[PDB]
Ligand binder design. Structure first.
Ligand code: CLF
Ligand code: CLF
Ligand code: MG
Ligand code: MG
Lengths: 473, 465, 464
């Protein structure tokens, strides 16, 4: 049924956002509202639309200036917070750029301030020739025309190419709207503006993977082994210009259907490129994905050679972890897609029971997927807030929570360990090896002497301090 | 002769900002108050990104709420988002007492009337909760002016105005007010000890000691500010205010002097030996209490430790320092006490008119035997570009968002100020005072020692120093 | 799955872990107020050890030599002892205690130290009628044991000497505490624990003031604080708490045999459980409750360690060397934070005792990885194992192992004695809850710097 938590008695609209799956229900009658306005004052986990454009998608690129047109905070706040390495020295993580908006620019306009900042950025780093300009709350409100400024800079600097995103934080309700605006602008303005050499009979784009702790680079070892050329990665370890070539691919493989389904949909509509949705987290899921890609291309035997080798290398460690993790209870409090990518993969491959899930910004589509794959007796929460997390903990008593570091640091006080469900602990977590990495961090998080020690009150004469025996795969 | 030169950043844009925006600093002020949840009126990122920043520095959660400005309220006004946010907070947090209502760029641009929303909310709260008093403080922090440093100072002043407006002046407390500025829990622990050893009653605003909270057997959460409404209201009753940070709370000391005739004493921020000495002399003057023998001892232990380092490892080594202005200027003075040469000081905001008048600039001009460049309105690209152009540095002192500059240039860096997320435990280590000067000096030496080993630069010398 | 003890397989030593017995006896003595040890042997046996203490502490400590020369090597050195005692007494009017520490030379030639003490006692009583100087014979041949054993022998001999002279008096109500060979910071932590638990205790020896101020009045305060009176009062204690089996427990047993002061030997308090069990033992013997303040310090330590253990420590391989109580205690601490101490090196000939240490069994029953404990080890043993392929993520040990870590490019945390190649470590506790926290954070910060210098996922140090 839907659930009115005690902490929500004075915001009873939240009942329509929380589903407890029970036997024999027709789940079509119990789909959480999702992607609706946030309630002010709740300590919702949501971020802003600008975040979804710059931090999550555009900022992943290795060779592009990220020009944030606004006051300095939006830039500061999106710098030193992500874990998307590159193979060029992590340019994307080392730098952030602001137009440093001041009051005069609010009153009289910021277009010249943007134009000057763009020329300065290109002059300070002459070997960088690509830029994305993002609006933020106040530059949207005052109506600065960043497309016109970008067009003028491109005329004055024939060496550069600039893309613009109109993504103030108050757009939409969350990060999701920033995904949408960026995807649609990119396909409308930049796809089909360059071509690259095709070096394989088999070509694809990999859409919706942001190279968290090297996920994309791990998956690339598969594509290289199989002889498949990736025209573009959207956007893990990517380049601006590769993304201009996306129309050339034969196949679009999608992992993050939330952030990046938009562009796959439009590439299918405009160019006829099929959309294949996979799960690139999960051990047996990865095998299914590789088998579908290989069946599409007619290279089934190469796929079976890869799968057999990867199982021989990694399945025994995965099974060691399954033996020790079977029956543990897990919560997943992340953006949305990892709920549906992980609930049944950790169940199938590790024996782990996902007892509670919360999505910051997922749509009703994401809830259809997670409830299809998830367990009875599990809570499914759209746009969860902090007091709800405490009440859910009391209800389900998780052994481990996959969530961001701040919430991890909160639930530590309750002696519940966490794994970073966003930026990972010791990743990558995609692919065959990655699911072993995820299992190892889960194992070390729960089988942790410090949890046992924290429970002991040394004042209690009846208590001793235990010793815990651990293991390793 | 050596020259101390002030200069602005020569670019309009920023690459690698030194500070966050005003609302972030207002949030930091507020999280130090017990039974406080700041409410940030603007888009959701203005809240969530700052909660993450505090988790990076402290490795703890702090509670801050958003008004969740969306498209409708951006176009038609956001007063109802404020007003609902206040009520949702009060309804769900029964012990809530203080809500700084912090504006953002968005809500300053659209001109929401925060004081009018506060009147609406006060009415609504008085009717719904006749047995509670919730203090709503208007905090005007447009992010297109100043920085988190100015936003911190504005929020402290607004909260103090709000609470003291409600309570007024009453029974003299016999206590000092102390505004240490933006410092770590370890700094607060050291100040409390100094006052206790000197037999001086004091409130430290804000008392952030318990930000370093235990993991307890009973699973209780103790990660809270310790400064109460009552503590803030009692500031009107103090014997004097000791303001340690010109840019981080002295304006509240000035307001209490104007409003309540509490005399304000601004001193140099107590980084290094002389500045700590002079802070203790001012406390003795204002209180009539003697400086204790225990502080003579702590001072002497610090000097003993620094004497093992200064002429051997520090003399003639060039240093760049960045961070909050009180910290940059104070650390420059500390560096010269131990024979370091702070040749480049970077201060990260638009407050240069104030910095040009800071008496510590003159103190540096009158002591330094080497040129010093003080870059105001600086970003961290100003440091990287100067290194690229050939500036030879032996040490960087600054916060962790400059780490890649030091890593790539192969310069040892000591992490100071805010945020220091890329090392463990620094929030627990004092930087101010005698013990803090010792700790800083030993961090510098240990960073140099490790660098000598990794680079094989006379690594054999670390035996009989 | 297996914890194995084995000896070094070479007869020779390359890169010794410890100094010889007399060095340890000197260390014991310098913690006594109004004490100047007199080292009966050649001059190097004194001067090199004074330098070693200056390396660790960055301070001078007074120790004298008997200056054995060629004539005494042929005819015996008693006259050098007797002169040395009088020259000390005549030139240091406040001197009260002289441990007379033998060396390899003076043990080989068989000088009769107790006979010389009788001569000097007569001489001193005649020349200084209103003075008492306590001369303690300390037999420390360097061709057995190590500075660990020499420390323990000197403590025991000084206690025997002084308590022989004063005997049993009125009950003090205090604990005796023998922390072993620890830093001034460890002494500061223990004093706080006893103060917070409202337990009166003498800490033998009290080395807090080894970290002495540079004072306006130019006073020298670099002294041991343990007095003759404090040592004599050990006879009158309620109980002895011995924290170190190899570093003073034998004095606790002596006071139990002589004066019926019950001795309680506990695991050296490295890490959380060992600290917990120390405090439970204090509570048991005193009847005093463990204070809330220690529950909180413990919880702050656990909170800090929890930010590190599974993220950065789990499955990392550690080698530890140092004094046996420190090595065994740090191995237990390491496992609490998910580190895997695969190689423990203990540096002297006391293997027949180490084989019976109950902490070995506590490791054999806990560890899920093989542990090799090499006794009679040198530091070449560590270097040679690394050269043969042992993969280590961390070394914990004293500064004379530094080049092993530097050359192998392995992060290293400086623990134990001497730690001369980093600043201020003598002031930082390693024992107790705060000590566990400080050790864990040194480990992490050493790993973090390593990650930056080696460009090994250095981008990950943002949102841990
Ligand atoms: S919801 Fe998002 S992060 Fe917020 S402002 Fe808006 S685009 Fe940006 Fe920016 S400068 Fe600071 S952090 Fe804000 S108050 Fe403005
Ligand atoms: S004066 Fe010189 S240093 Fe002294 S012993 Fe003689 S040659 Fe040597 Fe050696 S082992 Fe220790 S330090 Fe001595 S007691 Fe013997
Ligand atoms: Mg000293
Ligand atoms: Mg903590």
């Amino acid at each position: 049924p839907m659930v009115l938590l005690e902490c929500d008695k004075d915001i009873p609209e939240r009942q329509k956002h929380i589903y407890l799956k029970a036997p024999n229900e027709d789940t079509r009658e119990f789909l959480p509202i999702a992607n609706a306005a946030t309630i002010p004052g709740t300590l919702s986990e949501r971020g802003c639309a600008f975040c979804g454009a710059k931090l999550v998608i555009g900022g992943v690129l290795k060779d592009t200036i990220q020009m944030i047109h606004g006051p300095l905070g939006c830039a500061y706040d999106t710098w030193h917070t992500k874990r998307y390495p590159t193979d060029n020295g992590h340019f994307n993580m080392k730098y952030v750029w602001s137009t440093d908006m001041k009051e005069s620019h609010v009153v009289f306009g910021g277009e010249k301030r943007l134009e000057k900042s763009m020329h300065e950025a290109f002059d300070e780093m002459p070997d960088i020739k690509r830029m994305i300009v993002y609006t933020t709350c106040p530059t949207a409100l005052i109506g600065d025309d960043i497309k016109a400024v970008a067009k003028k800079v491109m005329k004055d600097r024939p060496d550069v190419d600039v893309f613009t995103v109109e993504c103030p934080g108050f757009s939409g309700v969350s990060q999701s709207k920033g995904h949408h605006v960026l995807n649609i602008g990119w396909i409308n303005e930049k796809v089909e503006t360059m071509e690259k050499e095709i070096t394989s009979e088999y070509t694809m784009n990999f859409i919706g993977d942001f190279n968290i702790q090297g996920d994309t680079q791990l998956l690339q070892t598969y594509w290289d082994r199989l002889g498949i050329q990736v025209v573009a990665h959207f956007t893990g370890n990517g380049t601006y210009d590769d993304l201009r070539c996306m129309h050339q691919a034969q196949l679009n493989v999608v992992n993050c259907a939330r952030s990046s389904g938009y562009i796959a949909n439009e590439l299918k509509k405009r160019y006829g490129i099929p959309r294949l949705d996979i799960d690139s987290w999960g051990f047996n899921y990865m095998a299914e994905g590789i088998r579908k890609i290989c069946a599409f291309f007619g290279i089934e035997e190469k796929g079976e050679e890869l799968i057999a080798e990867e199982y021989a290398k990694w399945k025994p460690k995965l099974d060691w972890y399954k033996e020790r993790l079977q029956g543990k209870k897990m919560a997943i409090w992340t953006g949305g897609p990892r709920l549906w990518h992980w609930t049944k993969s950790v169940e199938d491959d590790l024996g782990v029971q996902v007892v509670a899930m919360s999505s910051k910004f997922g749509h009703e589509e994401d809830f259809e997927k997670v409830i299809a794959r998830g367990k009875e007796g599990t809570y499914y929460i759209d746009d969860g807030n902090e007091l709800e997390f405490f009440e859910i903990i009391d209800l389900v008593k998780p052994d481990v929570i996959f969530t961001g570091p701040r919430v991890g640091e909160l639930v530590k006080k309750l002696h519940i360990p966490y794994v970073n469900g966003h930026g990972y602990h010791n990743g990558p977590y995609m692919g065959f090896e990655g699911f072993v990495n995820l299992a190892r961090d889960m194992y070390n998080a729960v089988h942790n002497p410090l949890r046992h020690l924290a429970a002991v009150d040394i004042r209690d004469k009846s208590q001793t301090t235990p010793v815990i025996v651990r293991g390793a795969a | 002769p050596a020259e101390v030169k002030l200069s602005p950043r020569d670019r309009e844009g920023i690459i690698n900002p030194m500070y966050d925006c005003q609302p972030a600093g207002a949030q930091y002020a507020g999280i130090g108050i017990k039974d406080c949840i700041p409410l940030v009126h603007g888009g959701q990122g203005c809240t969530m990104f700052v909660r993450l920043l505090f988790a990076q520095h402290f490795k703890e959660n702090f509670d801050v709420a958003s008004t969740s400005l969306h498209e409708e309220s951006a176009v038609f006004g956001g007063a109802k988002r404020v007003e609902e946010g206040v009520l949702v907070l009060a309804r769900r947090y029964p012990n809530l007492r203080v809500i700084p209502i912090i504006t953002t760029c968005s809500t300053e641009v659209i001109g929401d009337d925060i004081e009018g929303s506060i009147r609406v909310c006060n009415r609504a709260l008085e009717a719904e909760f006749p047995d509670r008093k919730i203090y709503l403080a208007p905090v005007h922090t447009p992010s297109f002016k100043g920085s988190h440093v100015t936003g911190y100072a504005e929020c402290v002043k607004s909260v103090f105005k709000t609470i003291t407006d409600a309570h007024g002046k009453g029974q003299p407390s016999g206590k000092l007010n102390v505004f240490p500025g933006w410092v770590n829990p370890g700094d607060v622990v050291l100040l409390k000890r100094y006052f206790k050893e000197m037999d001086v009653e004091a409130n430290i605003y804000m008392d952030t000691e318990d930000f370093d909270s235990p993991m307890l057997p009973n699973k209780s959460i103790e990660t809270h500010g310790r400064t109460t409404v009552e503590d803030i209201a009692d500031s009107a009753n103090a014997l004097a205010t000791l303001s340690l940070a010109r840019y981080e709370g002295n304006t509240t000391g000035e307001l209490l002097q104007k409003t309540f005739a509490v005399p304000n004493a601004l001193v140099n921020t107590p980084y290094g030996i002389k500045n700590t000495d002079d802070m203790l002399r001012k406390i003795a003057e204002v209180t009539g209490k003697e400086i204790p023998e225990s502080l003579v001892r702590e001072r002497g232990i610090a000097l003993d430790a620094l004497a093992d380092l200064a002429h051997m490892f520090f003399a003639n080594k060039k240093v760049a320092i960045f961070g909050h202005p009180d910290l940059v200027l104070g650390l420059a003075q500390f560096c010269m006490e131990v024979e370091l040469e702070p040749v480049l000081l970077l201060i990260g905001d638009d407050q240069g008119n104030k910095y040009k008048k800071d008496p510590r600039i003159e103190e540096l001009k009158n002591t330094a035997h080497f040129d010093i460049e003080i870059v105001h309105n600086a970003d961290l690209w100003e440091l990287e570009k100067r290194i690229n152009a050939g500036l030879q540095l032996d040490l960087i002192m600054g916060h962790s968002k400059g780490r890649y500059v030091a890593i790539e240039a192969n310069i040892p860096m000591v992490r100071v100020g805010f945020p220091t997320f890329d090392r463990a435990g620094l929030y627990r280590k004092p930087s101010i005072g005698y013990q803090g000067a010792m700790e800083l000096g030993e961090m510098i030496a240990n960073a140099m020692f490790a660098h000598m080993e990794y680079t094989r630069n006379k690594e054999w010398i670390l035996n009989t120093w």
